Amino acid sequence: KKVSITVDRDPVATSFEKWAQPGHFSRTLAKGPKTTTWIWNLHADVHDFDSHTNSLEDISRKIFSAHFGQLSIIFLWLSGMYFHGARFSNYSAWLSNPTAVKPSAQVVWPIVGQEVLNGDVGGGFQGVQVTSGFFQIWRSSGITSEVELYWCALAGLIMSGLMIFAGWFHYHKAAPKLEWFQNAESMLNHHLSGLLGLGCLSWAGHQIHVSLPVNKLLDAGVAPQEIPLPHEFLVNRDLMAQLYPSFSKGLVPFFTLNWSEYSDFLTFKGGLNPVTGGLWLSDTAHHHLALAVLFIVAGHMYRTNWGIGHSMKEILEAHKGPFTGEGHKGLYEILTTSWHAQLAINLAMLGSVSIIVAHHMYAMPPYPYIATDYPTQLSIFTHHMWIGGFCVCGGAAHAGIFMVRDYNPAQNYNNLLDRVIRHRDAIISHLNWICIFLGFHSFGLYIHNDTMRALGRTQDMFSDTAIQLKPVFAQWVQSIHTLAPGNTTPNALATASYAFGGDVVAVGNKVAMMPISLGTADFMVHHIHAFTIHVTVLILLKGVLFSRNSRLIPDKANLGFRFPCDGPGRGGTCQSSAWDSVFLGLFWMYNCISVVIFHFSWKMQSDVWGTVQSDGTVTHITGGNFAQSAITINGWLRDFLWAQASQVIQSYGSALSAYGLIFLGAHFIWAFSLMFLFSGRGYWQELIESIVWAHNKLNVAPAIQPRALSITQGRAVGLAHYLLGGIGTTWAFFLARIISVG
Amino acid sequence: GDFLIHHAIALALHTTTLILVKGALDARGSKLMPDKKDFGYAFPCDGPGRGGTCDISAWDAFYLSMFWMLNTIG
Amino acid sequence: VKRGSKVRILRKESYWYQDIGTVATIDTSGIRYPVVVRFEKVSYSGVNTNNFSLDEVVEV
Amino acid sequence: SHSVKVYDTCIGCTQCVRACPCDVLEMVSWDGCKAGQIASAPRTEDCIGCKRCETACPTDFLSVRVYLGGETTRSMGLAY
Amino acid sequence: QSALYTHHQYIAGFLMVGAFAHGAIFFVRDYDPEQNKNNVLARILDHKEAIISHLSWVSLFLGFHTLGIYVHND
Amino acid sequence: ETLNLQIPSPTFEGSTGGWLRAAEVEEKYAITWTSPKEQVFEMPTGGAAIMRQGENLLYLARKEQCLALATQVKNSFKITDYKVYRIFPSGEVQYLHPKDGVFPEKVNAGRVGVGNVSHSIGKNLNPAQIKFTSKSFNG
Amino acid sequence: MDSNFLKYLSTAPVLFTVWLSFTASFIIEANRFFPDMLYFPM
Amino acid sequence: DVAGLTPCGESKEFARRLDGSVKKLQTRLSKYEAGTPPALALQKQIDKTKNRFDRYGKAGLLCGTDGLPHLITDGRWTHSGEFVIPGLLFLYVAGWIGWVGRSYVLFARTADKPTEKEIIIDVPVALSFVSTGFIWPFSAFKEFTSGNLIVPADEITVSPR
Ligand code: CLA
Ligand code: CLA
Ligand code: CLA
Ligand code: CLA
Ligand code: CLA
Ligand code: CLA
Ligand SMILES: CC1=CCCC(C)(C)[C@H]1/C=C/C(C)=C/C=C/C(C)=C/C=C/C=C(C)/C=C/C=C(C)/C=C/C1=C(C)CCCC1(C)C
Ligand SMILES: CC1=C(C/C=C(\C)CCC[C@H](C)CCC[C@H](C)CCCC(C)C)C(=O)c2ccccc2C1=O
Ligand code: SF4
Ligand code: SF4
Ligand code: SF4
Distance (Å) from the C-alpha of residue A78 to the closest C-alpha of chain D?
A: 51
Q: In this structure, how many other beta carbons lie within 10 angstroms of the beta carbon of residue A245?
A: 12
* Alpha-carbon distances, residue A434 vs A430, A439, A587, A593 (angstroms): 6, 8, 19, 20
Q: In this structure, how many other beta carbons lie within 10 angstroms of the beta carbon of residue H22?
A: 16
Q: Is B37 on the interface with F (CB under 8 A)?
A: yes
Q: Which residues contact A716 (CB under 8 A, 6 or more apart)?
A: A583
- Closest atom of ligand 3 to CA, residue A351: 17
Q: Which helix (H) or strand (E) is B11 found in, with range?
A: helix B2-25
- Closest atom of ligand 1 to CA, residue A156: 17
Under DSSP, the state recorded for A251 is T
Three-state secondary structure call for residue C52: strand
d(CA A285, CA A304): 32
Distance (Å) from the C-alpha of residue H81 to the closest C-alpha of chain G?
A: 5
Is residue H11 within 8 A of residue H63, CB to CB? The reply is: yes
- As a three-state string, the secondary structure of A426-469 is HHHHHHHHHHHHHHHCCHHHHHHHHHHHHCCCHHHCECCCCECC
- As a three-state string, the secondary structure of A562-626 is CCCCCCCCCCCCCCCCCHHHHHHHHHHHHHHHHHHHHHHHHHHHHHCCEEECHHHCEEECCCCCH
List the one residue out of A63, A325, A295 whose CA is nearest residue A188: A295
List the one residue out of A739, A664, A680 whose CA is nearest residue A715: A680
Helices then strands, each counted (H, E), chain E: 3, 0
The answer to whether A708 contacts B53, with C-beta atoms less than 8 Å apart, is: no
Burial class of residue A396, CB neighbours in 10 A (0-12, 13-18, 19+): buried
Strands laid side by side in the C35-38 sheet: C49-52, C35-38, C20-26, C6-9, C57-59
d(CA A542, CA A420): 12
Q: Is H160 on the interface with C (CB under 8 A)?
A: yes
Q: Is F91 left (phi over 0), alpha (psi -120 to 50) or beta?
A: left
Three-state secondary structure call for residue B65: helix
| Ligand 7 pocket mutation, candidates E15, E16, E17, E20, criterion most atoms within 8 A of CB | E20
d(CA F29, CA B61): 42
DSSP symbols for A165-226? HHHHIIIIIEEEPHHHH--HHHHHHIIIIIIIIHHHHHHHHHIIIIIHHHHHHHHHT--GGG
> What's the one-letter identity of residue A11?
P
d(CA A724, CA A390): 13
The DSSP bridge partners found for residue C20 are C8
d(CA H49, CA G36): 10
Is residue A524 within 8 A of residue A364, CB to CB? The reply is: no
Strands laid side by side in the D3-7 sheet: D64-67, D3-7, F116-117
| Ligand 3 pocket mutation, candidates A81, A138, A193, A357, criterion most atoms within 8 A of CB | A357
d(CA A672, CA E63): 13
d(CA A605, CA A742): 9
CA atoms within 13 A on the CB side of H146: 7
> What's the one-letter identity of residue F75?
N
Helix axes A198-206, A281-298, angle to 10 degrees: 160
d(CA D2, CA A11): 57
Helix axes A56-87, A339-363, angle to 10 degrees: 30
Q: Is D51 left (phi over 0), alpha (psi -120 to 50) or beta?
A: left
The answer to whether B47 contacts D54, with C-beta atoms less than 8 Å apart, is: yes
| E interface test, pick of A690, A691, A700 with most E CB neighbours within 10 Å | A690
d(CA F138, CA G9): 56
Is residue F82 within 8 A of residue F33, CB to CB? The reply is: yes
Q: Is the CB of A668 under 6 A from ligand 5?
A: yes
User: Nearest residue CA, atom 32 of ligand 6?
Assistant: E57
List the one residue out of A131, A276, A132 whose CA is nearest residue A737: A131
Is residue A600 within 8 A of residue A537, CB to CB? The reply is: no
For residue F33, how far is the Cα from the chain centroid?
13
d(CA A426, CA F31): 27
A/G touch flag: 3 or more CB pairs below 8 Å: yes
DSSP symbols for A332-385? HHHHTT-HHHHHHHHHHHHHHHHHHHHHHHHHS--STT-SS-HHHHHHHHHHHH
> Looking at beta carbons, which residues of chain H come within 8 Å of C16?
157
Distance (Å) from the C-alpha of residue A549 to the closest C-alpha of chain D?
A: 13
* Backbone gaps in chain E, preceding residues (C–N over 2.5 A): none
d(CA A628, CA A463): 7
For chain A, positions 658-717, list CB contacts with chain B under 8 A.
Answer: 678-683, 685-687, 689-690, 707-708, 710-711
What are the residue ranges of helices labelled H in chain H?
Answer: 12-29, 37-57, 84-109, 116-119, 123-132, 136-145
Is residue C19 within 8 A of residue A701, CB to CB? The reply is: no
User: Nearest residue CA, atom 3 of ligand 7?
Assistant: E23
Q: In this structure, how many other beta carbons lie within 10 angstroms of the beta carbon of residue A2?
A: 7
Distance (Å) from the C-alpha of residue G42 to the closest C-alpha of chain H?
A: 6
* Alpha-carbon distances, residue A102 vs A89, A94, A291, A605, G11 (angstroms): 10, 7, 34, 19, 45
CA angle C11, C12, C15 (to 5 degrees): 85
Under DSSP, the state recorded for F98 is S
Under DSSP, the state recorded for A710 is P
CA atoms within 13 A on the CB side of B10: 15
A585: phi then psi, degrees, rounded to nearest 5: -80, -15
Pairing type for strands F39-42 and F48-51 reads antiparallel
Whether the CA torsion A567, A569, A570, A571 is positive or negative: it is positive
d(CA H156, CA H151): 8
Strands laid side by side in the H69-70 sheet: H6-7, H62-63, H69-70
* Alpha-carbon distances, residue C56 vs A186, C12, C34, C53, F25 (angstroms): 71, 9, 11, 6, 55
Helix axes B58-73, A681-697, angle to 10 degrees: 90
Three-state secondary structure call for residue G23: helix
| Ligand 1 pocket mutation, candidates G9, G17, G25, criterion most atoms within 8 A of CB | G17
d(CA E12, CA E6): 10
Q: In this structure, how many other beta carbons lie within 10 angstroms of the beta carbon of residue H81?
A: 18
Q: Is A34 on the interface with C (CB under 8 A)?
A: yes
End-to-end CA distance of chain G: 49
| A interface test, pick of E44, E45, E53 with most A CB neighbours within 10 Å | E53
- Closest atom of ligand 11 to CA, residue D49: 1
Q: Is H124 on the interface with G (CB under 8 A)?
A: no
Whether the CA torsion A96, A100, A102, A107 is positive or negative: it is negative
Which chains would you list as touching G if contact means 3+ CB atom pairs under 8 Å?
A, H
Q: Is the CB of A190 under 6 A from ligand 2?
A: yes
Largest CA distance in chain B: 49
Is residue A154 within 8 A of residue A75, CB to CB? The reply is: no
Dihedral Cα H150, H155, H159, H160, nearest 10 deg: 140
**Method of determination?**
cryo-EM
Nearest CA in chain B to H71: B3
d(CA A155, CA A148): 10
Q: Is the CB of D56 under 6 A from ligand 10?
A: yes
DSSP symbols for E49-72? HHHHHHHHHHHHHHHHHHHHHHHH
Under DSSP, the state recorded for A50 is G
DSSP symbols for B16-43? HHHHHHHHHHTSS--SS-TTGGGT-S--
Q: How far is the CA of G14 from the centre of ligand 10 (A)?
A: 44
Q: In this structure, how many other beta carbons lie within 10 angstroms of the beta carbon of residue F14?
A: 10
List the one residue out of A666, A656, A673 whose CA is nearest residue A727: A666
> What's the one-letter identity of residue H22?
V
The DSSP bridge partners found for residue A141 are none
> Looking at beta carbons, which residues of chain H come within 8 Å of G35?
48, 52
List the one residue out of D72, D61, D60, D66 whose CA is nearest residue D19: D66
List the one residue out of A380, A91, A150 whose CA is nearest residue A106: A91
| Ligand 1 pocket mutation, candidates A16, A19, A79, A83, criterion most atoms within 8 A of CB | A83
Is residue A393 within 8 A of residue A582, CB to CB? The reply is: yes
Q: Is E13 on the interface with B (CB under 8 A)?
A: yes
The answer to whether E52 contacts B17, with C-beta atoms less than 8 Å apart, is: no
Q: How far is the CA of A52 from the centre of ligand 8 (A)?
A: 26
The answer to whether A124 contacts H38, with C-beta atoms less than 8 Å apart, is: yes
Is the omega angle on the peptide bond into residue F98 within 30 degrees of 0, that is, cis?
yes
> What's the one-letter identity of residue A83?
F
> Looking at beta carbons, which residues of chain D come within 8 Å of A567?
49-52
Q: How many residue pairs bridge chain A and chain B with CB atoms within 8 Å of each other? A: 69
* Alpha-carbon distances, residue A14 vs A8, A18, E46 (angstroms): 15, 10, 58
Q: Which residues contact B31 (CB under 8 A, 6 or more apart)?
A: A685, A686, A689, C15, C44, H157, H159
Three-state secondary structure call for residue A35: strand
> Looking at beta carbons, which residues of chain H come within 8 Å of G36?
52, 55-56
Q: How far is the CA of E39 from the centre of ligand 7 (A)?
A: 20
List the one residue out of A264, A207, A254, A262 whose CA is nearest residue A230: A207
- Closest atom of ligand 2 to CA, residue A67: 60
Which pairs with CB-CB distance under 8 Å and at least 24 residues apart come from A570-576?
A570/D48, A570/D49, A570/D50, A570/D75, A570/D76, A570/D77, A571/D71, A571/D76, A571/D77, A572/B44, A574/B54, A575/A715, A576/A550, A576/A552
Q: Which helix (H) or strand (E) is A737 found in, with range?
A: helix A711-741
Is residue B34 within 8 A of residue F122, CB to CB? The reply is: yes
List the one residue out of A470, A738, A447 whose CA is nearest residue A608: A738
Burial class of residue A432, CB neighbours in 10 A (0-12, 13-18, 19+): middle
The answer to whether C17 contacts H157, with C-beta atoms less than 8 Å apart, is: yes
* Alpha-carbon distances, residue B18 vs A673, B24, B68 (angstroms): 20, 10, 10
DSSP symbols for A642-663? IHHTHHHHT-TTSTTHHHHHHH
d(CA B26, CA B29): 5
Q: How far is the CA of G27 from the centre of ligand 1 (A)?
A: 19
d(CA A111, CA A129): 19
d(CA F97, CA A408): 28
> What's the one-letter identity of residue A610?
G
Is residue D59 within 8 A of residue A553, CB to CB? The reply is: no
Q: What is the CA radius of gyration of chain F?
A: 20
Three-state secondary structure call for residue D43: coil
Pairing type for strands C6-9 and C20-26 reads antiparallel
List the one residue out of A372, A399, A364 whose CA is nearest residue A578: A399
List the one residue out of E22, E55, C16, E42 whose CA is nearest residue H161: E42
C/G touch flag: 3 or more CB pairs below 8 Å: no
B/G touch flag: 3 or more CB pairs below 8 Å: no
Is residue F11 within 8 A of residue D70, CB to CB? The reply is: no
d(CA A681, CA A36): 14
Is residue C13 within 8 A of residue F122, CB to CB? The reply is: yes
List the one residue out of B32, A113, A537, F38 whose CA is nearest residue H24: A113
Under DSSP, the state recorded for D25 is -
Q: How far is the CA of A693 from the centre of ligand 5 (A)?
A: 21
CA atoms within 13 A on the CB side of A418: 28
Q: Which helix (H) or strand (E) is F34 found in, with range?
A: strand F28-35
Q: In this structure, how many other beta carbons lie within 10 angstroms of the beta carbon of residue A12?
A: 16
Q: Which residues contact A349 (CB under 8 A, 6 or more apart)?
A: A395
d(CA A135, CA A157): 20
